[PDB]
Coordinates of all heavy atoms in Angstrom, one line a residue:
Chain R
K78 N 85.4 127.8 61.6 CA 85.5 126.4 61.7 C 84.1 125.8 61.9 O 83.1 126.5 62.2 CB 86.2 126.0 62.9 CG 87.6 126.6 63.1 CD 88.6 126.1 62.0 CE 90.0 126.8 62.0 NZ 91.0 126.1 61.1
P79 N 83.9 124.4 61.8 CA 82.5 123.8 61.8 C 81.9 124.1 63.2 O 82.6 124.2 64.2 CB 82.8 122.4 61.5 CG 84.1 122.4 60.8 CD 84.9 123.5 61.4
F80 N 80.6 124.1 63.3 CA 79.9 124.2 64.6 C 80.1 125.4 65.4 O 79.9 125.3 66.6 CB 80.1 122.9 65.3 CG 79.8 121.7 64.5 CD1 80.9 120.9 64.0 CD2 78.5 121.2 64.2 CE1 80.7 119.7 63.2 CE2 78.3 120.1 63.4 CZ 79.4 119.3 63.0
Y81 N 80.4 126.5 64.9 CA 80.6 127.7 65.6 C 79.2 128.1 66.3 O 79.2 128.4 67.4 CB 81.1 128.9 64.7 CG 81.2 130.2 65.4 CD1 82.3 130.5 66.1 CD2 80.1 131.0 65.4 CE1 82.4 131.7 66.9 CE2 80.2 132.3 66.1 CZ 81.3 132.6 66.8 OH 81.2 133.8 67.5
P82 N 78.1 128.1 65.5 CA 76.8 128.5 66.1 C 76.5 127.5 67.3 O 75.9 128.0 68.3 CB 75.8 128.3 65.0 CG 76.7 128.7 63.8 CD 78.0 127.9 64.1
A83 N 76.7 126.2 67.1 CA 76.4 125.3 68.2 C 77.4 125.7 69.5 O 76.9 125.6 70.5 CB 76.8 123.9 67.9
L84 N 78.5 126.2 69.2 CA 79.5 126.5 70.3 C 78.9 127.8 71.0 O 78.9 127.9 72.3 CB 80.8 127.0 69.7 CG 81.8 127.6 70.7 CD1 82.2 126.6 71.7 CD2 83.1 128.2 70.0
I85 N 78.5 128.8 70.4 CA 77.9 130.0 71.0 C 76.6 129.8 71.7 O 76.4 130.3 72.8 CB 77.7 131.1 70.0 CG1 79.0 131.6 69.2 CG2 77.1 132.4 70.6 CD1 80.2 131.9 70.1
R86 N 75.9 128.8 71.2 CA 74.6 128.4 71.9 C 74.9 127.8 73.2 O 74.2 128.0 74.2 CB 73.9 127.4 70.9 CG 72.4 127.5 71.0 CD 71.7 126.6 70.0 NE 71.3 125.2 70.6 CZ 71.9 124.0 70.1 NH1 72.7 124.0 69.1 NH2 71.5 122.9 70.7
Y87 N 75.8 126.8 73.2 CA 76.2 126.1 74.4 C 76.7 127.1 75.5 O 76.2 127.1 76.6 CB 77.1 125.0 74.1 CG 78.1 124.6 75.1 CD1 77.7 124.1 76.4 CD2 79.5 124.4 74.9 CE1 78.6 123.6 77.4 CE2 80.4 123.9 75.8 CZ 80.0 123.5 77.0 OH 80.8 123.0 77.9
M88 N 77.6 127.9 75.1 CA 78.3 128.8 76.1 C 77.4 129.9 76.6 O 77.8 130.7 77.5 CB 79.6 129.5 75.5 CG 80.7 128.4 75.2 SD 81.3 127.8 76.9 CE 82.1 129.3 77.5
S89 N 76.1 130.1 76.1 CA 75.2 131.2 76.5 C 74.0 130.5 77.0 O 73.0 131.3 77.3 CB 75.1 132.1 75.4 OG 74.4 131.7 74.3
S90 N 74.0 129.2 77.1 CA 72.8 128.5 77.6 C 72.6 128.5 79.1 O 71.8 127.9 79.7 CB 72.9 127.0 77.2 OG 74.0 126.4 77.8
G91 N 73.6 129.2 79.9 CA 73.5 129.3 81.3 C 74.7 130.1 81.8 O 75.6 130.4 81.0
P92 N 74.8 130.4 83.1 CA 75.8 131.2 83.6 C 77.2 130.5 83.6 O 77.3 129.2 83.6 CB 75.4 131.6 85.0 CG 74.6 130.3 85.4 CD 73.7 130.2 84.2
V93 N 78.3 131.2 83.6 CA 79.6 130.6 83.7 C 80.3 131.2 84.8 O 79.9 132.3 85.2 CB 80.5 130.8 82.4 CG1 79.8 130.2 81.2 CG2 80.6 132.4 82.2
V94 N 81.3 130.6 85.4 CA 82.1 131.3 86.5 C 83.5 131.5 85.9 O 84.2 130.6 85.5 CB 82.2 130.3 87.8 CG1 83.1 131.0 88.8 CG2 80.8 130.1 88.3
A95 N 83.9 132.8 85.8 CA 85.2 133.1 85.3 C 86.1 133.4 86.5 O 85.8 134.0 87.4 CB 85.1 134.3 84.4
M96 N 87.4 132.9 86.3 CA 88.3 133.1 87.5 C 89.7 133.5 87.0 O 90.1 133.2 85.8 CB 88.5 131.8 88.2 CG 87.3 131.2 88.9 SD 87.7 129.5 89.4 CE 86.7 128.6 88.2
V97 N 90.5 134.2 87.8 CA 91.8 134.5 87.4 C 92.7 133.9 88.5 O 92.5 134.4 89.7 CB 92.1 136.0 87.2 CG1 93.5 136.3 86.8 CG2 91.2 136.7 86.2
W98 N 93.6 133.0 88.1 CA 94.6 132.5 89.1 C 95.9 132.9 88.8 O 96.3 133.1 87.7 CB 94.5 130.9 88.9 CG 93.2 130.3 89.3 CD1 92.2 130.0 88.5 CD2 92.9 129.8 90.7 NE1 91.1 129.4 89.4 CE2 91.5 129.3 90.7 CE3 93.5 129.8 91.9 CZ2 90.9 128.8 91.8 CZ3 92.8 129.4 93.0 CH2 91.5 128.9 93.0
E99 N 96.7 133.0 89.8 CA 98.0 133.5 89.7 C 99.0 132.5 90.4 O 98.8 132.0 91.4 CB 98.1 134.9 90.4 CG 99.6 135.6 90.4 CD 99.5 136.9 91.2 OE1 98.9 137.9 90.7 OE2 100.0 136.8 92.3
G100 N 100.3 132.4 89.7 CA 101.2 131.5 90.3 C 102.3 131.1 89.3 O 102.1 131.3 88.1
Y101 N 103.3 130.6 89.8 CA 104.5 130.1 89.0 C 104.1 129.0 88.0 O 103.5 128.0 88.3 CB 105.6 129.6 89.8 CG 106.7 128.9 89.0 CD1 107.6 129.7 88.3 CD2 107.0 127.5 89.0 CE1 108.5 129.1 87.5 CE2 108.0 127.0 88.3 CZ 108.8 127.8 87.5 OH 109.8 127.2 86.7
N102 N 104.3 129.3 86.7 CA 104.0 128.3 85.5 C 102.4 128.0 85.7 O 102.1 126.9 85.1 CB 104.9 127.1 85.8 CG 104.8 126.3 84.5 OD1 105.1 126.8 83.4 ND2 104.7 124.9 84.6
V103 N 101.6 128.9 86.1 CA 100.2 128.6 86.1 C 99.5 128.3 84.8 O 98.5 127.6 84.8 CB 99.5 129.7 86.8 CG1 99.3 131.0 86.0 CG2 98.1 129.3 87.2
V104 N 100.0 129.0 83.6 CA 99.4 128.7 82.4 C 99.5 127.2 82.0 O 98.5 126.6 81.7 CB 99.9 129.6 81.3 CG1 99.4 129.2 79.9 CG2 99.5 131.1 81.5
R105 N 100.7 126.7 81.9 CA 100.9 125.4 81.4 C 100.4 124.4 82.5 O 100.0 123.3 82.1 CB 102.4 125.1 81.2 CG 103.0 125.8 80.0 CD 104.5 125.6 79.7 NE 104.8 124.3 79.2 CZ 104.8 123.1 79.8 NH1 104.6 123.0 81.1 NH2 105.2 122.0 79.1
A106 N 100.4 124.7 83.8 CA 100.0 123.7 84.9 C 98.5 123.6 84.8 O 97.9 122.4 84.8 CB 100.4 124.2 86.2
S107 N 97.7 124.7 84.5 CA 96.3 124.6 84.5 C 95.9 123.9 83.2 O 94.9 123.2 83.2 CB 95.7 126.2 84.4 OG 96.0 126.8 85.6
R108 N 96.8 123.9 82.2 CA 96.5 123.3 81.0 C 96.5 121.8 81.2 O 95.7 121.0 80.7 CB 97.4 123.6 79.9 CG 97.0 124.7 78.9 CD 96.2 124.0 77.9 NE 95.0 124.9 77.6 CZ 94.2 124.6 76.6 NH1 94.4 123.6 75.8 NH2 93.2 125.4 76.4
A109 N 97.6 121.3 81.9 CA 97.7 119.9 82.1 C 96.7 119.3 83.1 O 96.3 118.1 83.0 CB 99.2 119.6 82.8
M110 N 96.2 120.2 84.0 CA 95.2 119.8 84.9 C 93.8 119.6 84.3 O 93.1 118.8 84.8 CB 95.1 120.8 86.0 CG 96.3 120.9 87.0 SD 96.1 122.4 88.0 CE 94.7 121.9 89.1
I111 N 93.5 120.3 83.3 CA 92.1 120.1 82.8 C 92.1 119.0 81.8 O 91.1 118.4 81.6 CB 91.6 121.4 82.1 CG1 92.3 121.7 80.7 CG2 91.7 122.6 83.0 CD1 91.8 122.9 80.0
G112 N 93.2 118.6 81.3 CA 93.3 117.5 80.4 C 92.8 117.7 78.9 O 92.3 118.7 78.5
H113 N 92.8 116.6 78.2 CA 92.3 116.5 76.7 C 90.9 117.1 76.4 O 90.0 116.9 77.2 CB 92.4 115.1 76.2 CG 92.5 115.0 74.8 ND1 91.3 115.2 73.9 CD2 93.5 114.7 74.0 CE1 91.7 115.2 72.7 NE2 93.0 114.8 72.6
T114 N 90.9 117.9 75.3 CA 89.6 118.5 74.8 C 88.5 117.4 74.7 O 87.4 117.7 75.1 CB 89.9 119.0 73.4 OG1 91.0 119.9 73.3 CG2 88.7 119.7 72.8
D115 N 88.9 116.2 74.2 CA 88.0 115.1 74.0 C 87.9 114.4 75.5 O 88.6 113.4 75.6 CB 88.5 114.2 73.0 CG 87.6 113.1 72.7 OD1 86.4 113.2 72.5 OD2 88.2 111.9 72.7
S116 N 87.1 114.9 76.3 CA 86.9 114.3 77.6 C 87.0 112.9 77.7 O 87.6 112.3 78.7 CB 85.6 114.8 78.2 OG 85.5 116.2 78.6
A117 N 86.5 112.1 76.7 CA 86.4 110.6 76.7 C 87.9 110.0 76.7 O 88.1 109.0 77.2 CB 85.6 110.2 75.6
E118 N 88.9 110.8 76.2 CA 90.2 110.4 76.1 C 91.1 111.1 77.1 O 92.3 111.1 76.9 CB 90.7 110.3 74.7 CG 91.2 111.6 74.2 CD 91.9 111.5 72.9 OE1 92.8 110.6 72.8 OE2 91.6 112.2 71.9
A119 N 90.5 111.9 77.9 CA 91.3 112.7 78.9 C 91.7 111.7 80.0 O 90.9 110.8 80.3 CB 90.4 113.7 79.4
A120 N 92.9 111.8 80.5 CA 93.4 110.9 81.6 C 92.8 111.1 82.9 O 92.5 112.2 83.3 CB 95.0 111.0 81.7
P121 N 92.4 109.9 83.5 CA 91.8 110.1 84.9 C 92.8 110.9 85.7 O 93.9 110.7 85.7 CB 91.6 108.7 85.3 CG 92.4 107.9 84.4 CD 92.3 108.6 83.1
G122 N 92.3 111.8 86.6 CA 93.2 112.6 87.4 C 93.1 114.1 87.0 O 93.2 114.9 87.7
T123 N 92.8 114.2 85.7 CA 92.5 115.6 85.2 C 91.0 116.0 85.4 O 90.2 115.0 85.6 CB 92.8 115.7 83.6 OG1 91.8 114.9 82.9 CG2 94.3 115.2 83.3
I124 N 90.8 117.2 85.3 CA 89.3 117.6 85.5 C 88.4 117.0 84.5 O 87.3 116.5 84.8 CB 89.2 119.1 85.6 CG1 90.0 119.6 86.8 CG2 87.7 119.6 85.7 CD1 90.0 121.1 86.9

Side-chain angles (χ1 to χ4, degrees):
Chain R
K78 305 291 176 171
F80 308 105
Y81 176 84
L84 171 71
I85 300 306
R86 206 175 98 241
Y87 153 51
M88 290 296 289
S89 66
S90 62
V93 296
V94 176
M96 299 169 253
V97 182
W98 291 92
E99 179 187 286
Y101 174 66
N102 197 47
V103 75
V104 170
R105 291 177 81 280
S107 293
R108 263 281 140 169
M110 291 168 71
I111 70 175
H113 201 286
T114 304
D115 181 52
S116 290
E118 83 171 306
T123 63
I124 299 178

